[model samples]
Target chain A: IVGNVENLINGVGELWNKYVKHEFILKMRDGSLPLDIFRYYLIQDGKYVEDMLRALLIASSKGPIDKVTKILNLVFSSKGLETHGKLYSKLDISRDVIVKTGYNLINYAYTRHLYYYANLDWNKFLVAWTPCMFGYSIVGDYVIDSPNEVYKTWASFYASTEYKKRIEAILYALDEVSITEDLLNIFINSVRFEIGFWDASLRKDPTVY
Target chain B: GNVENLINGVGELWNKYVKHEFILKMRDGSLPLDIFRYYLIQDGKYVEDMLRALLIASSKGPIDKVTKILNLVFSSETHGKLYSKLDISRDVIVKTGYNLINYAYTRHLYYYANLDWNKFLVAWTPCMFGYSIVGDYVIDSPNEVYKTWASFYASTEYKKRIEAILYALDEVSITEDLLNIFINSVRFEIGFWDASLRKDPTVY
Candidate 1:
């Protein structure tokens, strides 16, 4: 078994290239992504954050209080909410308006995956939840030099020193647990969903009944 | 009114919601207590999120009257009161709360909040108006159980509020996008009722 959990995840290089290092991230870096797609992503991301909060609450109830509190504070109190709201505000994605949008398949699937794990085992839930913060930092650092101003805000946060520390704290905590195959598999599933999110945004996926 | 017809034009859908077997069971006082409990708890949860959406819509609007109307929904806390009476605890909800329909329905409102003001109005119109329409049609329902649920939408004040919302909608030029928003919400409205009767929510 891999000693460093992050390296174990990094070992899934093919999945990382296909999903995390997607063209959407590339487009975001180059500032060439269509405004509509960016807006679509922003809207869906907002919904994702809402469900993530619920998942975090569930996980926190079962996990160590201090570790969970750190993630929650980062999510609820940090730039994740404020910077997201501020960026979207310029595009009319106001606080009140954000609560009205529905989640598409990717966000729904991703959050439900966390919810499912949250109900079963807190460790699995943490594994499933880790990529949301971890993957962003990985991709954000890769694209931080992109001159696109709006995208820069997103890139900088994920690549920031503070955000990296948050991910480290989570990884350190996850290391304390027995990293079972099931945990690794669930984490892999979350990465797949993350890819679907970016791809769905690019494809302009609609929510159908 | 054309708006009423558009809602009724989705008559097949209206029937699905208003005349679902679950609702029919309610008509004769045969609704399983479990289902009724589920519906009340789910509806209560929906209303809490709906109130937040309404407040967001109110903040995003320029019209004073519409903002006032949305604000009124928050102050009343009617759904909160009704749900509290049902004895659903915070823990129960946390344990098995926020089914798929509830999450999707709330997301729909959030998406519209990011759009033009007219889109936001259209997004919410189906709920504001369609509930009363469903209530009026189901008023003669014989179910003594959950009478409050049935009559809540059918009230005279509720009717007036729907009229005011329609009047506001009428002021704007209805576009294809607006019509689509209205139709999708009505579909979600039907799904909400469908969700309450089932044991669990299915994935989209």
Candidate 2:
């Protein structure tokens, strides 16, 4: 039902299961310990997700040292900017989790339009997707119209021709919509991937004759 | 009021409902949340499972078991060897019996989290790896597969996600001392696999 992990390292379906499971637990446990609703709010309103993206971009940019730092300093500051800085120092899976989960929820709710589906006993929707079951807590300002919204957005980005337009639409969506814990994750991870795509491409030597 | 009968009746209902529900989740893919919910419910089997999971998660080089079970079914490895091995001064499962009791007593933490994780675990299992060995016991593995399983769990991402809650807490000025202790406890349990390995290297 999924592509080989080799081709789909960054694919959504592979990640979808992870997100469904992650949210299930957080929602079910009402976001345990530091996962409290306030923190959920913080990720959206606090700029933590954005900063994490900026960190990812700048760290992976492979540009002139001064250029990268200069660009990063202007964009990535937040309440947890220090932690974001530390996170930028490495491109690990945990970073992927932080970014992916945030991106997934937003895309799931607003972009993909899974909100109504999710609201159908919320956790059950997530359960149908995986073995994990999770309950919702306060809805946390998230909303969805259909799963297609996010899927189309991802399709555009992955295909490249419609990438810029889709990104513009997403930025608009990000601005117009209420940022929730899940949504914030989607935005952060999408930005990380966007930057990572360029970071790797920019490094290729053209070897012009 | 027939208080004793009422208590007994409710207890029986809970026992069947909880285990059956939990097993149902495990039959699918939602083990993590199920385990979390089971812990919340203070179920002894859940506590036992958690102890074993922690052990598998904590394995390092010269101390591997995660992979051994990964390639095979992990149903039941008796306690006699585990019990007797604790005779060593710094062995890991020295008081596993006590650890179970501690888990049994820590129901308050579960109460605080609510038992919602059960729903989450059942929902997330199928896509995770076909069948997860962590949910099984008596894991049987070919010689090489065990090490690979250990490496997979030891991968940086697995470690970080497992500890992300701690990092999240650190942001709030909270100490992760308890989380650290849990990590240590797991390390102790994993070390037993090393003991078995060392005691009989030719077993390889």
Candidate 3:
């Protein structure tokens, strides 16, 4: 609903810039957020992880952090990740780590039944979790209901677009103080919450796709 | 005018509930376009005409022409999946068009429920073209009518879910493998045509 995609992404980016510096200081103080919970966050936000696959592939191929840069160039008709490069890059880094880590960690979680983010409810999460099963693969084959039938489809990017639209609308509703670094950290935390809820389930089933 | 009339006319087909036999008859080569319009098109049944024409073209039209028509139909929609659910896309009122009418008779409700008009349109046209081609092979086989219908319904993937009420019919037992082969064949056929002109479609 917020008309300016650039401002929305930028506001997110501004918060990200400060969050990155703080996280770096925090990492120096301790280590990054608990890795298992971090992994869970990526899985719940299906769109973020799905897009990570493409970005990772692009980054591996292209040295510069230009996968999102290229996509934004395409989407916004601009150059160089635009004014929000830091946040976009931060998001891209977290997503890339989650997906690659997910490929490895999900197996770790599954074999050990290791779930670090205990405060998060599991049963209520499953309703949202099952659909996120769509993120692990480029494509999914699901059967809807009785008189079963199979379908081939993909969900990541499409899901992300809706997620982005909602986050943008919510941000617009709040007062217009430039989003703080604390806010950026919280946004990523919320994103992690969303993604982790889904990732835990995904880690449970590696061969879902 | 053709597009709007085409949209409305296609919508009316569900309302009339004409028999599949009548639909088949309308495809005869000798039938004039206007008469085709009268019996099928102008009756505000352009939807049936659209469905039948796509099937026939897929069944019999040259590969290039088949792709041409398929693209126009798919791209014409706002979103491929959303387009299929629109009254203009499937319904016509008064007399409801029976479900499972297509050659494969497979239905895909999920595709429609999450209907991305773009994706659904792309998914539906290919299946129709693919199923029609495969139907020819199934009919040519020694399988009985029920068996043929069963195989066609279960194997052929489609855009809507109502299309899958196969084997429920009298003796229909649409085997799954045959439908798979049919689907693969259609994919290969379309891919060949698509890859053939990848560089500059104008040259194609």
Candidate 4:
């Protein structure tokens, strides 16, 4: 990319690895995490996708239309939703689980931050949106050899060439927008929220204070 | 309790809110234009964000009937057109920001949107029904301007919309969580009216 996007991401690489690669994926790789907890995480992740869809709509409304369109295409084209459906079906988690799923404070904090910046400009919104997209791929590669069938399949999907192209498209979109220190701050904070989400999953609930 | 008794219990909230002096002043033509203007602008802000919450709730679940109702309420208008008809500009709303209560209220709606459709419906019910009830209750007041506001809420169309939602939600058992959502929304409604009596300083 023509921008300092790589540097910005590298800046928060350790924090990203802690949650996405080292913690959550590491647990998934060995199947140390209980089935029920993983199921709860998957349900919450489904809810997160719905909120992300809202965030994308907000971004489209506050256009730079071309870039918003590019990012939105990445969201819909990603296999995330299809995989989530398969996972839920395999786990026998009811659709009723979604409505009963109250957002933990971390989930609310992450989306609320994205929604607030989305009202400001497209660049800020991208900063908030990118970490989850990019982080998933990193974690996917890390766990590609997982012995667990579900983990192996999920990791392989995210690490696949199709998902890499999706990340590249998001990066290309970000390149067109100017990056600022404030944008970098939001980027790092977004990674922190990703960490918080994983930490919440393990802890059963997050404590904000 | 049945839906009818549940609604009847809302009467206490109605008295606290609709009978508050801020609304009572509007009834007698004594409410200041500035205060009335604040309510108009802030209420407009509330409506806009509430639309987003409704969309989120609609998208999340298998509530096909509830989804249809949300679409029916939201599908007829664009934000720009709604603002244009209301005679408020995007510029003015940005400058006004959201009052503390308005922010809290919208966040409450978003919170329910994240949780359960039944809770979201219960949360939204007061604004849906209370406005019309309050409008009908105060319909015979003296001021022409106030009368128009009352009539907008008291209109048969709006009343029918409220009834439609009650019928849609009737199949779901009312749990303690739903009741809490209802009570919290009513509290926010009362706070919203109180906030209306004073204006926030403009940012720009």
Query: Which candidate should be chosen as best, given TM-score against the real structure?
Result: 4
State each model's CA lDDT, in order: 0.69, 0.28, 0.30, 0.72
Per-residue C-alpha lDDT of model 1 across residues A97-184, encoded as one tens digit per residue: 5567677877788878887887566688888887787788888887788888788877877887878777877776687678767677
Model 4, A1-209: lDDT tens digits are 23556777777767756766656668889967677777767777766776776666556545554454555455444265576678789887777787667788888788788888866766788778888888788888877778887877667878988789878878877777777778888999998998888877776783232
TM-score for model 4? 0.50
Alpha-carbon runs more than 4 Å astray in model 1:
A10-13, A76-78, B1-204
- Candidate 1 has a DockQ of 0.02
Question: Regarding DockQ, does 1 or 3 come out ahead?
Answer: 3
DockQ of structure 4 = 0.03
Order of candidate numbers by lDDT, starting with the best: 4, 1, 3, 2
- Every candidate's fraction of true contacts kept comes to 0.00, 0.00, 0.00, 0.00
lDDT of 2 by residue, B1-204 (tens): 121222233333323322343334334434343233222222233333433232222221111122222212211122233223323121233222333333432332233222322221211121121112332311222323232333444444444433432222222221243333333333333332223223322111
| Greater-DockQ candidate between 1 and 4 | 4
Stretches off by above 4 angstroms in model 4 are A206-209, B1-204
Superposition error at B147 for model 3 (Å)? 33
User: For candidate 2 chain B, which ten residues in a row score worst on lDDT?
Assistant: B118-127
DockQ of each: 0.02, 0.01, 0.04, 0.03
Give per-residue CA lDDT, model 3, range B1-204, as digits (tens): 211222233343321222232223322233233332222112232233334223322322233333333333333111222223233332332143322222112223122213332222333433443344334433333423322332543342432222221111112222343233333333433332222223212110
Ranking by TM-score: 4, 1, 3, 2
Query: Which of 2 and 3 is the better model by DockQ?
Result: 3
Candidate number with greatest DockQ: 3
Q: Give TM-scores of chain A for all candidates.
A: 0.90, 0.23, 0.23, 0.88
